[PDB]
Amino acid sequence: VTLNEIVGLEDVKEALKEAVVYPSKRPDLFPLGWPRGILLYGPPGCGKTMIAAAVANELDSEFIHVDAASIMSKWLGEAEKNVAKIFKTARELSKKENKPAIIFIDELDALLASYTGEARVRNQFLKEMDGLADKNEISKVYVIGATNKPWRLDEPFLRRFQKRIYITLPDKAHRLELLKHYSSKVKLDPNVNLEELAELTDGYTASDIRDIVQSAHMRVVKEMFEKNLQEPRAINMDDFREVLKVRKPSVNQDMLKAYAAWH
Numbered sequence: 001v002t003l004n005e006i007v008g009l010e011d012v013k014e015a016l017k018e019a020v021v022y023p024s025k026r027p028d029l030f031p032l033g034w035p036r037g038i039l040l041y042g043p044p045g046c047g048k049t050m051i052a053a054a055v056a057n058e059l060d061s062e063f064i065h066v067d068a069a070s071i072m073s074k075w076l077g078e079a080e081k082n083v084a085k086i087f088k089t090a091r092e093l094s095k096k097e098n099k100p101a102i103i104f105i106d107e108l109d110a111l112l113a114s115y116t117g118e119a120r121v122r123n124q125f126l127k128e129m130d131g132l133a134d135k136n137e138i139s140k141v142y143v144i145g146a147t148n149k150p151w152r153l154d155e156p157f158l159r160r161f162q163k164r165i166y167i168t169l170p171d172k173a174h175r176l177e178l179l180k181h182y183s184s185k186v187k188l189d190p191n192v193n194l195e196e197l198a199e200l201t202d203g204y205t206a207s208d209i210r211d212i213v214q215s216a217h218m219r220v221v222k223e224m225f226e227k228n229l230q231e232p233r234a235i236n237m238d239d240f241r242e243v244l245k246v247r248k249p250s251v252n253q254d255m256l257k258a259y260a261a262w263h
């Protein structure tokens with residue numbers, strides 16, 4: 001998974017290049033240092049995972065994909081042990097290959113939740129993060145965290161991520177490119193208006209949009225199968241309309257401004 005495979009997020013692409021790629025490739029050029037914690041926050045299905053992997057891939061760095069919910073445990077002492085082990089692994093990958101290591105931690109807010117005092121997982125995580133910054137550390141390790149509930153992160157936690165990037169719902173023009181992108185792979189009737197579809201999909205995420213196209217395709221595929229035909233008819237505008245009547249956005253009303261509030 002590469003950067004060219006991601007439709008929008010040109011300024012996000014830039015920010016991460018700036019935070020990770022450039023200092024990894026030219027450390028001498030950052031005499032004022034750089035942060036090693038990047039936080040991607042926003043609604044789900046907006047490309048957070050995608051973009052983290054797309055930069056690991058750009059740098060050809062070592063990569064560790066972690067789901068924070070997976071690290072947690074209903075027994076004492078396992079969650080902070082798991083945390084310690086991930087960072088250690090990374091440190092060692094980095095020094096062994098003499099190259100940077102990227103840990104992508106998805107569902108970051110999970111570290112703060114109650115499975116069992118939750119403080120002990122937090123404090124270990126906070127210590128590893130401060131450890132990355134240490135000017136005696138030989139390993140070059142970066143942490144890219146993602147959440148769709150940033151309000152669940154406390155402020156000391158936020159202080160370890162000195163770069164913090166809001167990834168929003170796609171705008172009309174973003175939606176149009178996503179539409180163009182996903183629909184390119186299926187066959188459309190000339191009466192189909194991407195422009196109007198762009199407008200009707202306000203509130204919908206990038207994966208929602210993919211799902212809308214998939215779901216529209218399925219109307220024709222289903223038509224072919226149930227009549228035992230060879231190939232399906234092209235997708236028409238009404239097909240999208242019927243999908244839109246029944247598929248509402250993954251992101252409801254308030255959550256959209258929980259996000260802009262916190263941002």
Ligand SMILES: Nc1ncnc2c1ncn2[C@@H]1O[C@H](COP(=O)(O)OP(=O)(O)O)[C@@H](O)[C@H]1O
Pocket residue numbers: 005006007008009043044045046047048049050051146206207210
């Ligand atoms: N900018 C984008 N361009 C192309 N596809 C996207 C984009 N954003 C999201 N997607 C699609 O949505 C899916 C979910 O994206 P993901 O990176 O997991 O979202 P997040 O991590 O923000 O919850 C991906 O498999 C991809 O199919």
